[PDB]
Write a protein that binds this ligand. Structure first.
Ligand SMILES: COc1cc(/C=C2\SC(=O)N=C2N)ccc1O
Length: 127
């Protein structure tokens, strides 16, 4: 059993910005989801070896998790807020694609997604 390498979190030739929307994504959005009681499965890449999910990376070809997002935000990896919002949405969608409705992990993702949507609704205008 093998896990793929994680998503990229460092790339010196990718242009980067530090913007008020990206600061909101770290200070408000990521921090709110990270502290939630259902955050733990999403705080690092899925370890398909330890979890005995040998088909996980056959089905999920664009993996994403909040550990990766946290690193991207803390290392100013992004150019704009849309790129980070897409990462969160990829994380939720992967969970719904791989699992069954009503599975514990899906209910956990849904609770985090509800908070995510609430916070993104008040994403500040770009200064
Ligand atoms: C079973 O599908 C998923 C599993 C996880 C992670 C888990 S599950 C567990 O017990 N520990 C973990 N770190 C994350 C997203 C998924 O879609």
């Amino acid at each position: 059993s093998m896990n793929p390498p994680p998503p990229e979190t460092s790339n010196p030739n990718k242009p980067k910005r530090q913007t008020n929307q990206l600061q909101y994504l770290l200070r408000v959005v990521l921090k709110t989801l990270w502290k939630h009681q259902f955050a733990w499965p999403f705080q690092q890449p899925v370890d398909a070896v330890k979890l005995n999910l040998p088909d996980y990376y056959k089905i999920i070809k664009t993996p994403m998790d909040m550990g990766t997002i946290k690193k991207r935000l803390e290392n100013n990896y992004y150019w704009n807020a849309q790129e980070c919002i897409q990462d969160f949405n990829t994380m939720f969608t992967n969970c719904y694609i791989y699992n069954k409705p009503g599975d514990d992990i899906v209910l956990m993702a849904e609770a985090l997604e509800k908070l995510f949507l609430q916070k993104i609704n008040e994403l500040p205008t770009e200064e």
